[PDB]
Automatic annotation (TrEMBL), chain A:
DNA-dependent RNA polymerase catalyzes the transcription of DNA into RNA using the four ribonucleoside triphosphates as substrates. This is DNA-directed RNA polymerase subunit beta. Signal peptide: none annotated. Component of the RNA polymerase II (Pol II) complex consisting of 12 subunits. It is found in: Nucleus. The lineage of its organism: Eukaryota, Fungi, Dikarya, Ascomycota, Saccharomycotina. Belongs to the RNA polymerase beta chain family.
Automatic annotation (TrEMBL), chain D:
The keyword Amino-acid biosynthesis does not apply. Signal peptide: none annotated. Keywords: Metal-binding, Nucleus, Transcription, Transcription regulation, Zinc, Zinc-finger. Zn(2+) 1 binds at C11, C14, C35, C38. This is Transcription elongation factor 1 homolog.
TrEMBL record, chain E:
GO terms for cellular component: DSIF complex; kinetochore; mating-type region heterochromatin; rDNA heterochromatin. Pfam families: Spt4 (PF06093). Residues 1-79 form the Spt4/RpoE2 zinc finger domain. It is found in: Chromosome, Centromere; Nucleus. This is Transcription elongation factor SPT4. Keywords: Centromere, Metal-binding, Nucleus, Transcription, Zinc. One of its GO terms (biological process) is 7-methylguanosine mRNA capping. Belongs to the SPT4 family. One of its GO terms (molecular function) is zinc ion binding. Signal peptide: none annotated. The SPT4-SPT5 complex mediates both activation and inhibition of transcription elongation, and plays a role in pre-mRNA processing. This complex seems to be important for the stability of the RNA polymerase II elongation machinery on the chromatin template but not for the inherent ability of this machinery to translocate down the gene.
UniProtKB/TrEMBL annotation, chain G:
This is RNA polymerase subunit ABC10-alpha. The chain holds residues 28 to 72 of 72 of the full protein. It comes from the Eukaryota. Belongs to the archaeal Rpo12/eukaryotic RPC10 RNA polymerase subunit family. Coiled coil: none annotated. Zn(2+) 2 binds at C23, C26. One of its GO terms (molecular function) is zinc ion binding. Keywords: Metal-binding, Nucleus, Zinc. It is found in: Nucleus. GO terms for biological process: DNA-templated transcription. Zn(2+) 1 binds at C6, C9, C23, E25, C26.
Length: 88, 48, 49, 64, 102, 511, 45, 214, 96
RNA sequence: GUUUUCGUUGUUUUUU
């Protein structure tokens, strides 16, 4: 598994929209079986360690092959700060 | 702007080649200037 | 670490920092070599020594 | 200056490829060909615009 | 395309179901026997694809014994072995079958 | 219809019967977007749907087949795949719907399409510029070479908008060095150069009088006569079309053993075919080719004399931007040619079984689909097996970081000249972009000065049929090229349409 | 169990990771999850 | 005795033109039918036989006498390399071109095709025709743990026992002989109708598991 | 050793063998094919061709920048990365 | 209970 946490995940392996998020946080809970008990492996999606915010919009749909296919949008404000660039 | 873009790269190439040319030369306790092989370049650094 | 960086700090001549930085802060490694052939063809085990 | 040319051209008699030697001799405007297997030779006038390929073409046009 | 045991001529399997072996059917009766006999006399596994168009003077024909046989596709090697009945009939009629797989 | 017939045969003597299994192709049929769900359900799409579920905004396409039998004893709407469709286009599901249903389908009106949606990814093509083809181009070659001036042209068929070949000429001999000032030509599918007089003689005008007429038109220009004189002197061995042709056919880069029987005919073929196909591709107009060649060599000699400026290669009016039209045309052309190859072959190892193929089990539309998909998604304008020698970066991911970035992104060009050799002419701005590309906007460093942008008033031609122009010229006393005399029409105007010599006229002002 | 909602008809429905994911009410082939049940804060700065 | 039928100079020569890979049989049959149809015509083909061998893949050899006959034969055939990559066949190798060139019961063999591939077997019966043979393997069954196969998801092998089959999930004909699931099991081993194609006996070296078991 | 030419995992578990291992296996196959030639029909020209291909494989596995002859590749259309290619270049072991 | 891991190679873009 990942050094990040999994509690914010949902009972299905997802995360509710509008949930606070920190970097290195597992946002998508996916698993894969192990070729032959205890025959599965982590296939999760930790959030970018440098990126934090809140979940904007959680999509769950099937890809062209019909397999479950999610598109997860996170969001956050970008506040101008010392050294941030501006131009005329 | 074109000339600047060309010149920076070409000059960088020249600098790289030159630094490779003279990367080992040293002044020594004798005050001579010799290479890694020890062949003296100058009998005295800057003659001074 | 850039080539011109090596060039500049050699113009300075910070030999010790150079060696450690290129060793400690990079992929340092230890091996064993047979002097007779002078090559790294040694068959070594430690606990058996 | 003579120029012996051990070419890749195939000769019709002994049917061996690279057996045709197209030695061009422009001195008299008269060509020369040799085979190392059946020793067949061909003759043809050679202008300032003739080549071993043109010589082989002339040979095919003449023999057959 | 099943390679005939005796002569070696090969034709699409439909050909043997319907048109038969040009030379061996007289003694092998592939057209007029159960498909078991056809397959045993003509195996689906073969090797040494030899196309023969002229056999009267071809050295390949003399080696392959198809100088008399109709020109066509021939297989040098045929695996397996003939069952008892086919070879027994061949030897009764005077046809000493020579396996060509060696 | 560029490749409208596949002809097969079967001379089976098992009784000589010629079973010609010929295949013809019907009209092209284009559908609107309609995907198939893994549930099997099919529905017309919308770009945003693909964006959400990572699909490609493409429309199924049908072409009509035709299987015809010609057995002498002596089709259907086939789904060929789905073609990605640029949004808002006549085949676009968003072209209509006005301002309102775009809201219902959650579409920003301020988008103007112009891009391609692939697997939910909006992709934008980058147009490539190029000099105009079939133009005479004389240049001063580097002095350290026997060649002094190089006349160049890449002949391409006007129909199909596709390159065919190129021919180049060179002024052999240096100023009083290299013996005389001779000229030899370079040809497609050859291996050597040939004296220009020889290629004149193989094309019909063996005598040098006609050659000079077609070449020199001011006989007072004795200077021209004496520069060409060594060319005339060296052109005395060949005196008829057949010797000139076999001579030429001897250097046709072909196999060995063609003998003069077929060598002359192959030489005449390459004189006709592969040679100025844009001028003519059939017989009886080799005179037109001779006249055009004489004009081109006359231009070359004028340039050698340097009485005229060397054609500024940077003069932008010669440059030409290939819109998506020619690009996709060539891509689908090669893909359809591969499809033709594979289907015609499958006919071969499926007609042997003499099974009445359904024209369905034979065809796998995956070829065109996957080929276009790769060439676009990865941007390589070429097959996945010809990645090298294939122009990459033609298609790019669009820019939506800000509005105007996208805007320029839709008004950007490309210069496929390569970064090999720094040089200054290309990146340098030239007066001949006046009002054509954004003078100030340009990339930085490697891309600076080469990629360009449509000026706010620059407009791109889509192409028009030319024959009505021919009629207008014919309508107005067009003087043919065969009625062209160096002395008579000494002040007349040579006529050119789409850049090729299309007649003579004496009073051009009124017309 | 978990509460979802359609994008077209605007109806909430719950699947239990057993039904193939399709709109329970208008067949629209794109669903979404709902807000969480925990409380949210904002510094309003 | 074929040795008196050895080739000689008087016999027609052989020109070996290589063709596109996998299309050599195509060229052989093309030449055959082209020769048959053009036999007796005003432009006859001086080719006596055409043949291809498995070892010399991509190599096609035609018995002829003149290069013109070969040139006309291969003319109109696209499956042939554009090159005239042909080398005259010497006297000795004419027969070596057509030269054709072990299995017994109780011999160790390996499986290739299907799902039971890579499992050593011991032949115990051979069909009369010489096409199919029966074996002696180690049965590989999941005992219903995943039934409600492929060649890459299997666990290790174990010798068959009656108690495990009885408990986990079965017709007892002879002592130790049970035909279960369309498969024969004698002495706790595996018997099945395995094609002669699916098996090979030559050049097999037993492995650590095999020496532990066999 | 495998340390030089280990396994690269294009996608998590899916590992594409390092091209060095690929060409090593290729050269071993060519060697064995030459080995498989002589005990059976090996009519000289076949031996010459097979050994020529083996030499081509060895040279490519050494270098693919051999002037006057085209490069070696994989099924992807990508030319093989010869050892020299690994070694030289601005990103080579030395410079890189 | 200590302990403990994500890919490549390309491409194109900009960043000075
Ligand atoms: Mg800056
Ligand atoms: Zn040692
Ligand atoms: Zn000879
Ligand atoms: Zn028979
Ligand atoms: Zn709904």
């Amino acid at each position: 598994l990942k050094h990040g946490t999994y509690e914010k995940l949902d009972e299905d392996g997802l995360i509710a929209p509008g949930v606070r998020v920190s970097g290195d946080d597992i946002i998508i809970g996916k698993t894969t079986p192990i070729p032959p008990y205890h025959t599965k492996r982590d296939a999760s999606t930790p959030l970018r360690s440098t990126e934090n915010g809140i979940v904007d919009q959680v999509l769950l749909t099937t890809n062209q092959e019909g397999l479950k296919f999610v598109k997860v949008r996170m969001r956050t404000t970008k506040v101008p700060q010392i050294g941030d660039k501006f131009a005329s | 702007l074109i000339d600047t873009a060309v010149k920076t790269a070409e000059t960088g190439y020249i600098q790289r080649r030159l630094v490779k040319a003279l990367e080992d030369i040293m002044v020594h306790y004798d005050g001579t200037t010799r290479n890694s092989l020890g062949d003296i370049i100058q009998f005295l650094y800057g003659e001074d | 670490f850039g080539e011109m960086e090596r060039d500049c700090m050699i113009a300075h001549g910070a030999a010790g920092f150079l060696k450690e930085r290129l060793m400690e802060a990079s992929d340092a490694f230890r091996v064993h070599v047979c002097g007779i052939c002078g090559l790294m063809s040694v068959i070594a085990n430690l606990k058996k020594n | 200056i003579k120029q012996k040319l051990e070419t890749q051209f195939t000769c019709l008699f002994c049917n061996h490829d690279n057996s045709v030697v197209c030695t061009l001799d422009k001195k008299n405007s008269i060509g020369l060909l040799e085979c190392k297997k059946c020793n067949l030779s061909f003759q043809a006038p050679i202008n300032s615009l003739s080549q071993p390929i043109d010589i082989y073409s002339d040979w095919i046009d003449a023999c057959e | 395309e099943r390679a005939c045991m005796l002569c070696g001529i090969v034709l699409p399997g439909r050909v043997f179901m319907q048109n038969g072996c040009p030379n061996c059917d007289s003694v092998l009766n592939l057209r007029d026997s159960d498909q078991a006999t056809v397959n045993e006399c003509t195996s689906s596994s073969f090797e040494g694809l030899v196309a023969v168009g002229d056999n009267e003077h071809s050295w390949v024909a003399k080696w392959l014994r198809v100088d008399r046989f109709q020109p066509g596709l021939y297989a040098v090697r045929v695996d397996g072995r003939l069952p008892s009945d086919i070879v027994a009939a061949l030897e009764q009629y005077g046809v000493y079958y020579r396996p060509r797989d060696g | 219809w560029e490749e409208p017939r596949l002809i097969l045969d079967q001379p089976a003597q098992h009784d000589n019967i010629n079973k010609r299994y010929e295949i013809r192709f019907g009209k092209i049929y284009l559908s609107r977007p309609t995907m198939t769900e893994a549930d099997g359900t099919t529905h017309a799409m919308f770009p945003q749907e693909a964006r959400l579920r990572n699909l490609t905004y493409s429309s199924p396409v049908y072409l009509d087949m035709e299987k015809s039998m010609f057995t002498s004893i002596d089709g259907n709407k086939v789904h060929i795949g789905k073609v990605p469709i640029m949004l808002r286009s006549k085949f676009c599901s968003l072209r209509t719907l006005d301002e309102v249903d775009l809201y219902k389908m959650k579409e920003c009106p301020y988008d103007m399409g112009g891009y391609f949606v692939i697997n939910g990814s909006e992709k934008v093509l980058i147009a490539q510029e190029r000099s105009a083809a079939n133009i005479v181009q004389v240049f001063k070659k580097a002095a350290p070479s026997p060649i002094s001036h190089v006349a160049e042209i890449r002949s391409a068929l006007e129909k199909g908008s596709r390159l065919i070949s190129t021919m180049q000429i060179k002024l052999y001999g240096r100023e009083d060095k290299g013996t005389g000032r001779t000229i030899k030509a370079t040809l497609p599918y050859v291996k050597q150069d040939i004296p220009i007089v020889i290629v004149f003689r193989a094309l019909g005008v063996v005598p040098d009088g006609e050659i000079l007429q077609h070449i020199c038109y001011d006989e007072n220009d004795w200077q021209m006569l004496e520069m060409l004189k060594p060319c005339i002197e060296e052109g005395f061995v060949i005196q008829d079309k057949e010797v000139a042709l076999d001579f030429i056919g001897r250097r046709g880069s072909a196999a060995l053993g063609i003998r003069r029987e077929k060598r002359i005919q192959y030489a005449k073929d390459i004189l006709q075919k592969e040679l100025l196909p844009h001028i003519t591709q059939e017989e009886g107009f080799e005179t037109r080719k001779t006249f055009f060649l004489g004009y081109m060599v006359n231009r070359l000699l004028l340039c050698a004399l340097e009485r005229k400026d060397q054609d500024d290669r940077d003069h932008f009016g010669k440059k030409r931007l290939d819109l998506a039209g020619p690009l996709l045309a060539n891509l689908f052309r090669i893909l359809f040619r591969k499809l033709t190859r594979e289907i015609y072959r499958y006919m071969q190892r499926c007609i042997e079984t003499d099974r009445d193929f359904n024209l369905n089990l034979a065809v796998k539309s995956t070829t065109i689909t996957s080929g276009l998909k790769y060439s676009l998604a990865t941007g390589n304008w070429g097959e996945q097996k010809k990645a090298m020698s294939s122009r990459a970066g033609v298609s790019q991911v669009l820019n939506r970081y800000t509005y105007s970035s996208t805007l320029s992104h839709l008004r950007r060009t490309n210069t496929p000249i390569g970064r090999d050799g720094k040089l200054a002419k290309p990146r340098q701005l030239h007066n001949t972009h006046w009002g054509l590309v954004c003078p100030a906007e340009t990339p930085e460093g490697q891309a600076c000065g080469l990629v360009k942008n449509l000026s706010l008033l620059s407009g791109i031609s889509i192409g028009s049929p030319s024959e009505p122009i021919i009629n207008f010229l014919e309508e107005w006393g067009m003087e043919p090229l065969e009625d062209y005399d160096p002395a008579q029409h000494t002040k007349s105007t040579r006529i050119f349409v789409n850049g090729v010599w299309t007649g003579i006229h004496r009073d051009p002002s009124m017309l | 169990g978990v509460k979802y909602t359609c994008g077209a008809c605007a109806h909430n429905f719950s699947l239990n990771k057993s039904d193939p994911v399709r709109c329970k009410e208008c067949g629209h082939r794109v669903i979404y999850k709902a807000r969480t049940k925990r409380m949210i804060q904002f510094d309003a700065r | 005795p074929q040795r008196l039928l050895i080739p000689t100079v008087d016999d027609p020569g052989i020109w070996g033109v290589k063709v596109r890979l996998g299309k050599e049989k195509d060229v052989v049959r093309q030449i055959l039918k082209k020769k048959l149809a053009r036999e007796g015509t005003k432009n006859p083909l001086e080719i006596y036989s055409a043949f291809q061998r498995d070892s010399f893949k991509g190599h096609v050899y035609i018995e002829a006498r003149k290069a013109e006959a070969i040139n006309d034969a291969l003319k109109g055939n696209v499956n042939v390399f554009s090159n005239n990559s042909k080398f005259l066949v010497g006297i000795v190798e004419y027969k070596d071109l057509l030269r054709p060139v072990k299995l017994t019961r109780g011999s160790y063999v390996r499986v290739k095709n299907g799902k039971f591939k890579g499992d050593l077997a011991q032949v115990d019966e051979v069909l009369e025709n010489g096409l199919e043979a029966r074996l002696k393997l180690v049965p590989r069954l999941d005992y219903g743990k995943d039934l409600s196969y492929t060649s890459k998801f299997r666990p290790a092998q174990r010798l068959f026992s009656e108690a495990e089959a009885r408990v986990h999930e079965i017709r007892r004909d002879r002592d130790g002989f049970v035909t279960y699931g369309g498969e024969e099991y004698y002495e706790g081993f595996l018997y099945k109708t395995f094609r002669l194609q699916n098996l090979i006996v030559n050049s097999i070296n037993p492995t650590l598991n095999e020496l532990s078991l066999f | 050793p495998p340390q030089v030419r280990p396994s690269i995992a294009m996608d998590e578990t899916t590992q594409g063998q390092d091209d060095l291992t690929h060409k090593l296996s290729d050269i071993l196959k060519a060697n064995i094919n030459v080995q498989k030639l002589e005990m059976d029909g090996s009519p000289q020209h076949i031996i010459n061709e097979v050994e020529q291909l083996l030499q081509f494989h060895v040279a490519t596995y050494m270098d693919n920048d051999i002037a006057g002859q085209p490069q070696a590749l994989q099924k992807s259309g990508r030319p093989v990365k010869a050892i020299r290619a690994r070694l030289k270049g601005k990103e080579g072991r030395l410079r890189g």
